[PDB]
């Protein structure tokens, strides 16, 4: 029957930010850009004409500025990570390491991170914003300019078929999300999203049984360990409870990690509105600090901050989104209006935020090095000096085809440790472009096979690894060293001296490189006995 | 300046000329075409958005696509389909025939209202698109015999039903031109829940792991979202939401006309070869269209995407048997809406045990214990009805030391939630609700003396199977999806007893006749799904 029914109709938008036009953000205008606009009035309504050339130009300051600078809230976290008495020493060192990288990047020659990311555009074209309609082509051109004329990295791999792939050669196409919105302006958020943090976007399908403090707290405790250290913490953690579909939930959790939703309300209503959840944002941070995971190597600063947005849901549904912003916190707001192009101003003076080292010579027989490494327990910090072999997914895959017919393991797979990494482009007159590690766990499947054929005894990367790497190292007497994640520019400037392609030339950044390093920082993570320095915080 | 743009998605029919559209009578009166600065523009009375959205989210609950219908006839015409496959597919065709009377919707789950809108550069709406589309949905759902399925969160844990099926998911994209194109999807919660994302690696990208992965992953869909499934698989993507958005649209066939070859500039393509490999496992899995057989799935879509070198996202999502999406567009001639097939009967190829439920459960348990799992049966008599809120509430009642609800001890428990009742009808659409979402309560409740006889849809955990074997219980599987034909033909009387504030989740009392179900788990350790997970 009808007795709990209702009455009149009231539209309430799901997203109701209190700062819809991002007035809380400081913007700078692109000089002379009033030449791109003309005030008109049509059918009694005011409209705005935009030269589509502006999109290439606009997308190119944003996708240039953003690879060298961070937002103040990211930077405040780094100053804070150093000054907190409760931060571990390793937090401070990593934050110091991360802070030193950011200072190098502001020189505009070396990019702040090695993984210069996927180019993502969120666009909102006003009803009366007239661009000529070629928005997508010109925006893609601006990213291309940033990536063609600067020392960034091409990270996107096109699939010619299921297994045959080729590089696009310019890190294009971009993700262009152009939304239709009210008004006559054009608003943008540009995001250069690292693959590592894009990969740390997880979807779980849960139920109402989850929606209680005890279960949800336990869920967050349980699931946070699965984020690990593989996306260069401190993290901005975003958690989205509810959503009208998985993809909408994941888009929402993506933007929260990007602080796009910071000005939402903090209470729900009977009409179903998004809200920020301060209590559960606080709860996420409490879990992060007590987790002991720390800034890559143990401590309190697993996370800068957290955003938790509660959304409405279908009775049959409970989508949940979890996503991070990484150390390379890279986003930029902008808008176009009758006065021209305005672009979020980032902090040009990072300096106000500015406040165990055992040398291991790798230029020795690897058997002497294995013996020395075998002398120390996991968690031991080290500084590496000598030759590294650089190889990641495609180089591993190329190496795997030889290995797949059961013999021989190529000799070049047996002489040196395998460094999972991919460098950014080398600036003119510089020895190396940005060059930090990439997540070890993704190459985990190659170690046991290679070790069983007498190679890949030592691997070097970032991120927690699977039991197979621990098991492999214990059986064969191997070691895994973790470089600091994020400081790609200062490693290249001070530590990385030469890069040459060794194998698989047809590949791009994913070829095998041979490099010689000095003062390369790492921790002994896995020893030759079954030990793993993450076994307590990451099980 | 050696730059060449290649869109990721390059459909060969981006405006869906292959789809048939009808003009809304008189809708040319709501628009007037103008030309500004040498370009063509369109003034649109936003009532067109309401009208389209209010007809779209009415029509789509009563009719299906031909490619959907063709699948059921194929399931009927295949000599290798099981008998149980053919009955369900026939029932769905019969349900569609029941639904075509335009009063009862084919499913009780009127879905999440999803609108994909694509506003051309020179398409001018007045800017209140969101308000006017939402107004149209409210009209469709307020004035029709649908269901209000959206639950507003007052805080993180306190929830209430919104009472009108709003808000919708409105993904309005900016594209070239001056027209307005739409795909409307009424997405059931059960299948929305059965959209899974896995983070895999290059190590997957070999025949054995991917084939095995597909074998492994297909089973995790189970039968809990009312198969036959349209299965869409997307390998790669630039972000989770893009992988999941793409697999959603592929499963709704929005991307069916993509190219079949890739290129060096990074474009999506369909891979027909791997669709065939997915289907053989689906058929040989034995999971079937809910109750065993070959027609676990109607068809598959597999799209290979570009990827970040460090990444290999994989998205899996389905459109269920209640396949409810409608393409539409607004142009210079008025409002055009995809014309669906209004005579589904043409897809029908024209060329048991009487159980008295009005007894003590001990007589039924003794009799039922005599039969093996997998038997099709037709039930006649009393069912006790309880779902999500009652399930959450029943655990809460027992936690305050009050054991087992009065209504849980007198009758077999039928897990279900009704749609609104049409004037003069005994019942609105009244199909089952997924048992699996309540599994964590199931072991507790049976161990505490309740839920001895269950009737629902979906695979259940081994603990539920073990319980019926341990306690001499039975789980009966209703067919999932045919909510309308059960109400018209099987359910004769329904009365509300307590807790009306729960809406669709209130307690109801119903009398049924010729109610079909399967013996899924018996009281002897047998489970008709035991072969689904090998
Ligand atoms: S900081 Fe770490 S997670 Fe972020 S883009 Fe760089 S390597 Fe990837
Ligand atoms: S077929 Fe099943 S899962 Fe799909 S909408 Fe209908 S009731 Fe929901």
UniProtKB/Swiss-Prot annotation, chain B:
<dbReference type="GO" id="GO:0097014">
    <property type="term" value="C:ciliary plasm"/>
</dbReference>
<comment type="subunit">
    <text>Homodimer.</text>
</comment>
<dbReference type="GO" id="GO:0006099">
    <property type="term" value="P:tricarboxylic acid cycle"/>
</dbReference>
<dbReference type="GO" id="GO:0046872">
    <property type="term" value="F:metal ion binding"/>
</dbReference>
<protein>
    <recommendedName>
        <fullName>Fumarate hydratase 2</fullName>
        <ecNumber>4.2.1.2</ecNumber>
    </recommendedName>
</protein>
<keyword id="KW-0408">Iron</keyword>
<keyword id="KW-0963">Cytoplasm</keyword>
<dbReference type="InterPro" id="IPR011167">
    <property type="entry name" value="Fe_dep_fumarate_hydratase"/>
</dbReference>
<dbReference type="InterPro" id="IPR004646">
    <property type="entry name" value="Fe-S_hydro-lyase_TtdA-typ_cat"/>
</dbReference>
<dbReference type="GO" id="GO:0006106">
    <property type="term" value="P:fumarate metabolic process"/>
</dbReference>
<dbReference type="InterPro" id="IPR036660">
    <property type="entry name" value="Fe-S_hydroAse_TtdB_cat_sf"/>
</dbReference>
<feature type="binding site">
    <location>
        <begin position="193"/>
        <end position="199"/>
    </location>
    <ligand>
        <name>(S)-malate 2</name>
    </ligand>
</feature>
<keyword id="KW-0456">Lyase</keyword>
<keyword id="KW-0004">4Fe-4S</keyword>
<dbReference type="Pfam" id="PF05681">
    <property type="entry name" value="Fumerase"/>
</dbReference>
<feature type="binding site">
    <location>
        <position position="147"/>
    </location>
    <ligand>
        <name>(S)-malate 1</name>
    </ligand>
</feature>
<feature type="binding site">
    <location>
        <begin position="433"/>
        <end position="437"/>
    </location>
    <ligand>
        <name>(S)-malate 1</name>
    </ligand>
</feature>
<keyword id="KW-0479">Metal-binding</keyword>
<feature type="binding site">
    <location>
        <position position="320"/>
    </location>
    <ligand>
        <name>[4Fe-4S] cluster</name>
    </ligand>
</feature>
<dbReference type="GO" id="GO:0005737">
    <property type="term" value="C:cytoplasm"/>
</dbReference>
<dbReference type="GO" id="GO:0020015">
    <property type="term" value="C:glycosome"/>
</dbReference>
<comment type="similarity">
    <text>Belongs to the class-I fumarase family.</text>
</comment>
<dbReference type="GO" id="GO:0051539">
    <property type="term" value="F:4 iron, 4 sulfur cluster binding"/>
</dbReference>
<dbReference type="InterPro" id="IPR004647">
    <property type="entry name" value="Fe-S_hydro-lyase_TtdB-typ_cat"/>
</dbReference>
<dbReference type="GO" id="GO:0005829">
    <property type="term" value="C:cytosol"/>
</dbReference>
<dbReference type="GO" id="GO:0042803">
    <property type="term" value="F:protein homodimerization activity"/>
</dbReference>
<feature type="binding site">
    <location>
        <begin position="108"/>
        <end position="109"/>
    </location>
    <ligand>
        <name>(S)-malate 1</name>
    </ligand>
</feature>
<feature type="binding site">
    <location>
        <position position="387"/>
    </location>
    <ligand>
        <name>(S)-malate 1</name>
    </ligand>
</feature>
<feature type="binding site">
    <location>
        <position position="190"/>
    </location>
    <ligand>
        <name>(S)-malate 1</name>
    </ligand>
</feature>
<dbReference type="InterPro" id="IPR051208">
    <property type="entry name" value="Class-I_Fumarase/Tartrate_DH"/>
</dbReference>
<keyword id="KW-0411">Iron-sulfur</keyword>
<dbReference type="Pfam" id="PF05683">
    <property type="entry name" value="Fumerase_C"/>
</dbReference>
<dbReference type="GO" id="GO:0004333">
    <property type="term" value="F:fumarate hydratase activity"/>
</dbReference>
<comment type="function">
    <text>Cytosolic fumarate hydratase that catalyzes the reversible hydration of fumarate to (S)-malate.</text>
</comment>
<feature type="binding site">
    <location>
        <position position="107"/>
    </location>
    <ligand>
        <name>[4Fe-4S] cluster</name>
    </ligand>
</feature>
<dbReference type="GO" id="GO:0006108">
    <property type="term" value="P:malate metabolic process"/>
</dbReference>
<feature type="binding site">
    <location>
        <position position="457"/>
    </location>
    <ligand>
        <name>(S)-malate 1</name>
    </ligand>
</feature>
<feature type="binding site">
    <location>
        <position position="226"/>
    </location>
    <ligand>
        <name>[4Fe-4S] cluster</name>
    </ligand>
</feature>
């Amino acid at each position: 029957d009808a007795s709990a029914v209702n009455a009149d109709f009231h539209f309430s938008a799901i997203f109701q930010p209190t700062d819809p036009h991002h007035h809380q953000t400081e913007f700078a205008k692109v000089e002379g850009s009033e030449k791109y606009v003309e005030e008109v009035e049509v059918f009694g309504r005011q409209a705005l004409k935009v030269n589509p050339e502006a999109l290439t130009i606009l997308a190119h300051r944003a996708f240039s500025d953003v690879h060298h600078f961070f937002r103040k809230d990211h930077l405040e976290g780094w100053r804070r990570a150093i000054e907190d008495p409760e931060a571990s020493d390793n937090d401070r060192y990593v934050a110091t390491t991360l802070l030193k990288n950011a200072c190098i990047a502001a020189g505009r020659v070396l990019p702040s991170c090695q993984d210069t990311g996927t180019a993502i555009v969120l666009g909102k074209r006003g009803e009366l914003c007239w661009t000529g309609g070629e928005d997508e082509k010109y925006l893609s051109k601006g990213i291309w300019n940033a990536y063609r004329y600067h020392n960034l990295r091409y990270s996107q791999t096109a699939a010619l078929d299921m297994f045959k792939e080729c590089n696009t050669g310019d890190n294009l196409p971009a993700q262009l999300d152009l939304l239709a919105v009210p008004g006559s302006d054009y608003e943008f958020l540009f995001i250069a999203k690292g693959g590592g943090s894009a990969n740390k976007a997880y979807l779980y399908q849960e139920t109402k049984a989850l929606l209680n403090p005890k279960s949800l707290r336990a869920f967050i405790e349980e699931k946070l360990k699965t984020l690990g250290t593989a996306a260069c913490p401190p993290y901005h953690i975003a958690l989205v409870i509810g959503g009208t579909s998985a993809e909408m939930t994941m888009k929402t959790v993506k933007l929260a990690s990007c602080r796009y939703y910071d000005s939402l309300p903090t209470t729900g209503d009977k009409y179903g509105r998004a809200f920020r959840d301060p209590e559960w944002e606080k709860i996420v941070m409490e879990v992060a600090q007590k987790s002991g995971i720390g800034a890559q190597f143990g401590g309190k600063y697993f996370a800068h901050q957290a955003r938790v947005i509660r959304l409405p849901r279908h009775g049959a549904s409970c989508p949940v989104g979890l996503a991070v912003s990484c150390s390379a916190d890279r986003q930029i707001l902008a808008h176009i209006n009758k006065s021209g192009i305005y672009i979020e101003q980032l902090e040009q003076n990072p300096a106000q935020y500015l406040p165990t080292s055992v040398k291991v010579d790798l230029k020795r027989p690897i058997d002497k090095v294995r013996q020395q490494l075998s002398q120390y327990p996991v968690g031991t910090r080290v500084m590496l000096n000598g030759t590294l072999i650089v190889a990641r997914d495609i180089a591993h895959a190329k190496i795997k085809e030889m290995m797949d017919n059961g013999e021989p393991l190529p000799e070049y797979m047996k002489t040196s440790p395998i460094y999972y990494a991919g460098p950014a482009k080398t600036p003119e007159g510089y020895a190396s472009g940005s060059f930090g590690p990439t997540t070890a766990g993704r190459m985990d499947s190659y170690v046991d096979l290679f070790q069983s054929h007498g190679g890949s005894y030592i691997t070097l990367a970032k991120g927690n690894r699977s039991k197979q790497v621990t098991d492999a190292c214990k059986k064969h007497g191997g070691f895994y060293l973790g470089s600091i994640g994020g400081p790609a520019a200062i490693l290249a400037k001070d530590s990385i001296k030469q890069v040459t392609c060794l194998a698989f030339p047809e590949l791009g950044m994913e070829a095998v490189w041979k490099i010689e390093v000095e003062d390369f920082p790492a921790f002994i993570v896995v020893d030759d006995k079954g030990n793993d320095m993450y076994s307590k915080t990451l099980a």
